[PDB]
Amino acid sequence: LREELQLLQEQGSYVGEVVRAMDKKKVLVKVHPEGKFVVDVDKNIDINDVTPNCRVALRNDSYTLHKILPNKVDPLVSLMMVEKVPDSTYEMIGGLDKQIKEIKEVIELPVKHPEL
Amino acid sequence: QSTYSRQIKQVEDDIQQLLKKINELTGIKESDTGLAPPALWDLAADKQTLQSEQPLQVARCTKIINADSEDPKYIINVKQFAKFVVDLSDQVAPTDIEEGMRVGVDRNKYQIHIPLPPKIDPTVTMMQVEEKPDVTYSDVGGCKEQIEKLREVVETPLLHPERFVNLGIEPPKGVLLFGPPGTGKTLCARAVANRTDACFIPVIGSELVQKYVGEGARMVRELFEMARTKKACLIFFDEIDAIGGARFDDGAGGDNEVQRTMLELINQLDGFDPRGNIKVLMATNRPDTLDPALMRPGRLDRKIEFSLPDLEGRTHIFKIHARSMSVERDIRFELLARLCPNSTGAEIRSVCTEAGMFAIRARRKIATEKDFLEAVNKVIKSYAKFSATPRYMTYN
Amino acid sequence: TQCRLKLLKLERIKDYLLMEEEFIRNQEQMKPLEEKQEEERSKVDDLRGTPMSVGTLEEIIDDNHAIVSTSVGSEHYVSILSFVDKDLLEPGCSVLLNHKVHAVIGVLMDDTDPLVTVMKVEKAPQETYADIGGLDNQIQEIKESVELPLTHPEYYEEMGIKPPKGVILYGPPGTGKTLLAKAVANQTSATFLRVVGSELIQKYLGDGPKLVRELFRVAEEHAPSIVFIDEIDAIGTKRYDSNSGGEREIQRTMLELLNQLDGFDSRGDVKVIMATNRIETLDPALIRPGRIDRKIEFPLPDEKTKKRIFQIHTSRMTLADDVTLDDLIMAKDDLSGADIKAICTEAGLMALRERRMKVTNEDFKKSKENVLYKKQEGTPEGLYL
């Protein structure tokens, strides 16, 4: 408990994500509400144990990395959620049974198996 | 020899391994140092590092009002648009910073070390700029009637204002060069530019239009002024239907963004002041889009039409072009030009280019009659229908 | 020839060995590089420290200062740091700044944008050269213009003309105008940049001409190049009325391409092959002879040209005696190369509907009807003939 206040008090923190990871032992991170910064790697997380577009934590005024958040973030993943895929099954829609066959062949078949 | 060959392959790996040591000493990548000029600069450089002269944040001074607490203060508005009241760092006098002038302030300590050069905020306009270009003098047709008319207005005050004052003639201002694409408004302007040997800034208006309404306008005034200050400047404004279009709105659109900039150019040429002796040339793609302010004499003294180069011009472009080229000389260069229909300048040259290509194709030290006939019969049929001129000329 | 290779090699051996020799040996002996060489390495590394703010080099000023605009929302007129060179900061490249006090520590990054990525298109096409049969003359014309000066510019610039550039591809659409640029591009081995003409007019205001500059600038840097501009016909045909940039946007874009092409810029090694429907529907500003020396008009494809293209597609397709090429070609009129491609692609698709992985004479006969209607359709024309 004694120790917790010392750990707890810190300059602050930031949340960025790795845009790119160099071969120069610096990592390119964009902190979310500010610009991009190029910073040296920490002990815990560096270039070999990171893959880009992995959200990573920073401890402020040094921007050294703490722990890797296992979740991935891209602009594309949020977009998908916001637009929202429908609930309605082809059955529900039906009476368009003649239509579900026609659409199926051109859209669905080449994405599922482009191999064929 | 064999030993020497081995090194060719090798040097590439050898530079890659060494690369952290190269980077530090010569430059680029890890520890960028040039070693030749930053070394020499190093003693002066130490003064700046010690001070808060880094940062020295981009700003322009609104007003130099001094006030109490720390006496030498200036009221500045930064280029990102918020004002700070700042201090003077001792290294200049309050005289050096002046109202409206561009100035540097710190971000960590807000104070002026050295004032920032005024009016050089467009980078976009600079992108296009090549000073004194020209394809080669031979493609022009050399001295045409068109070139000579252009020199009287253009060359002569830049070269000598002395002769102007002596005779007692007002110095000219504006030449308006017009015609549909490819009648060479830009080609002739480059040729006179080189001859006069005045510094030459040509610019496309399409980069002095950028972001929203009013930012492009700031770029045009500052650029123009800067040139005006400069003694013996020639500005060739290249293709303006991008700061030169029609004036209207209909309230389902609007030409505004274009008109703000166009009007800003027009205003500046003579000014509300007498006139300078620094020349402006405008190249326009339509004579149908121009408003009367631009047309007034003293912002446009004589109108010269470079549209569809003249009867003399069609033959000169082929022969002066032909002169340069290795071609047959038993064919009349004028016959090929004459065949060309209502020829734009670009079109006359198109015959020479197509004619020569066949000759290069063979790899002869001349050309033959056959190369010329296929070229010219092809040009008369197809190209002429497909020129700029049938569509544009009726409109204009 | 061989002797030359030895001379070139001569500069390069000395460059690697000298840099290696000098760094280590000179800190060791007397005081030449010595204290000064450590000093540059150390000072830059400490100032840079953690973190560094990224900025972009807008301009360089002659008085040991520069205009950097930083990615923190503030612009700076920086002062140069001791032992960093002003004149190694490219206007193409972005520079790294120490984020405590703004001075250029150095360039570890040149940075990258999604804007670059549009211009650069890599091609590795299913159909390429010798997968096109017939219309043999049309390929030879293209090459005299594009391939021959691009490979060997030396005579062409030397004779006195600017090098003949490009070709304009017009006539009946469908001849195989798109295949031809991609195929010739492999033979010459020119970097193939593909960008649509309609993509250049977009919502954003003033981004439109800037993009066109980038398209040309990147083509030039890559070195041998051809820019295939697909569907350029599009700017002219449509006054879109769906862009906030408006009629203003269309105007300013159209001029910039002309500027970048030749202009006063007069860039070389950049051929533009223009794909259009017709050049009678194309915008009159853009079109004009003497930027493009040669124009090619394809004839209507005949029965004869059609057989050679089909033999190739038959080779790519499942092999059988139930493939009947001749019948389909004969039935059809004097009409495009595209159709030969369409009959083969629709035939495979058609098979999947059946629950068959076979493409037989039945899939083809059904395919002949749809392809023929869509493309031009013979039953209107039969009356007029």
Curated annotation (Swiss-Prot), chain A:
Keywords, in A-Z order: Acetylation, ATP-binding, Cytoplasm, Nucleotide-binding, Nucleus, Phosphoprotein, Proteasome
An annotated Gene Ontology molecular function: proteasome-activating activity
Superkingdom, taxonomy of origin: Eukaryota
Statement: the UniProt record of this protein carries the keyword ATP-binding: yes
Cell compartment(s), UniProt: Cytoplasm; Nucleus
Role summary: Component of the 26S proteasome, a multiprotein complex involved in the ATP-dependent degradation of ubiquitinated proteins. This complex plays a key role in the maintenance of protein homeostasis by removing misfolded or damaged proteins, which could impair cellular functions, and by removing proteins whose functions are no longer required. Therefore, the proteasome participates in numerous cellular processes, including cell cycle progression, apoptosis, or DNA damage repair.
Subunit composition and interactions: Component of the 19S proteasome regulatory particle complex. The 26S proteasome consists of a 20S core particle (CP) and two 19S regulatory subunits (RP). The regulatory particle is made of a lid composed of 9 subunits, a base containing 6 ATPases including PSMC5 and few additional components. Component of a complex with USP49 and RUVBL1. Interacts with PRPF19. Interacts with TRIM5. Interacts with NDC80. Interacts with PAAF1. Interacts, in vitro, with the thyroid hormone receptor (in a thyroid hormone T3-dependent manner) and with retinoid X receptor (RXR). Interacts with ERCC6.
Family named by the database record: Belongs to the AAA ATPase family.
Name under which the protein is recorded: 26S proteasome regulatory subunit 8
Organism: Rattus norvegicus (Rat)
UniProtKB/Swiss-Prot annotation, chain B:
Gene3D superfamilies, alphabetized: 1.10.8.60, Nucleic acid-binding proteins, P-loop containing nucleotide triphosphate hydrolases
One of the GO BP terms on file: ubiquitin-dependent protein catabolic process
Residues found modified as N6-acetyllysine: 79, 385
Predominant cellular place of this UniProt entry's protein: cytoplasm
Compartment(s) where it occurs, according to its Swiss-Prot or TrEMBL record: Cytoplasm
Alphabetical UniProt keywords: Acetylation, ATP-binding, Cytoplasm, Nucleotide-binding, Phosphoprotein, Proteasome, Ubl conjugation
InterPro entries linked to this entry: 26S_Proteasome_ATPase, AAA+_ATPase, AAA_lid_3, ATPase_AAA_core, ATPase_AAA_CS, NA-bd_OB-fold, P-loop_NTPase, PRS7-like_OB
Name of a matching Pfam family: AAA
Residue numbers binding ATP: 179-186
Post-translational modification: Monoubiquitinated by RNF181. Phosphorylated. Dephosphorylated by UBLCP1 which impairs PSMC2 ATPase activity and disrupts 26S proteasome assembly.
SUPFAM superfamilies: P-loop containing nucleoside triphosphate hydrolases
A cellular-component GO term for this protein: proteasome complex
UniProt-recorded Gene Ontology molecular function terms: ATP binding; ATP hydrolysis activity; general transcription initiation factor binding; proteasome-activating activity; TBP-class protein binding
Coiled-coil intervals, chain numbering: none
Family, as annotated: Belongs to the AAA ATPase family.
Function: Component of the 26S proteasome, a multiprotein complex involved in the ATP-dependent degradation of ubiquitinated proteins. This complex plays a key role in the maintenance of protein homeostasis by removing misfolded or damaged proteins, which could impair cellular functions, and by removing proteins whose functions are no longer required. Therefore, the proteasome participates in numerous cellular processes, including cell cycle progression, apoptosis, or DNA damage repair.
Subunit organization: Component of the 19S proteasome regulatory particle complex. The 26S proteasome consists of a 20S core particle (CP) and two 19S regulatory subunits (RP). The regulatory particle is made of a lid composed of 9 subunits, a base containing 6 ATPases including PSMC2 and few additional components. Interacts with NDC80 and SQSTM1. Interacts with PAAF1. Interacts with TRIM5.
Organism: Rattus norvegicus (Rat)
From Swiss-Prot, chain C:
Keywords (A to Z) from UniProt: Acetylation, ATP-binding, Cytoplasm, Isopeptide bond, Lipoprotein, Membrane, Myristate, Nucleotide-binding, Nucleus, Phosphoprotein, Proteasome, Ubl conjugation
Region called Disordered, residue ranges: 29-49
Top-level taxon of origin: Eukaryota
Ranges of biased composition (kind: Basic and acidic residues): 31-48
Topology class, membrane: Lipid-anchor
Family recorded in the similarity comment: Belongs to the AAA ATPase family.
Name of the protein: 26S proteasome regulatory subunit 4
Lineage: Eukaryota, Metazoa, Chordata, Craniata, Vertebrata
